[PDB]
């Protein structure tokens, strides 16, 4: 979240393990640099039960 932008870079890939995050390389392209320009200190996630 910079320059008055919110900065989201991302990627979509699979995994084939059981309980971990993997090794192996990749890169994240951008998603959006959002024109919000606010102050943020923390957050929470959202997930559907």
């Amino acid at each position: 979240n910079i320059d008055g932008y919110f900065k989201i870079y991302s990627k979509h890939t699979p995994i084939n393990l059981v309980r971990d995050l993997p090794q192996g390389f990749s890169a994240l392209e951008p998603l959006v640099d959002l024109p919000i320009g606010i102050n943020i200190t923390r957050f929470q996630t959202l997930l559907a039960l």
Binding site: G4, Y5, D33, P35, G37
Partner: protein
């Protein structure tokens, strides 16, 4: 106790002063400039 608002009640025979007048107020706000003018751009040759 009187109603707050009145009706103009425009008629076709309205006078230049009373005739109805559409209004549009355009205020520009900047703080990424998103809306710009007719980007006039030119023709690409090589």
């Amino acid at each position: 106790c009187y109603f707050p608002l009145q009706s103009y009640g425009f008629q076709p025979t309205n006078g230049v002063g009373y005739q109805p007048y559409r209004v549009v107020v355009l205020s520009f706000e900047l703080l990424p400039a998103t809306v710009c003018g007719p980007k006039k751009s030119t023709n690409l040759v090589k």
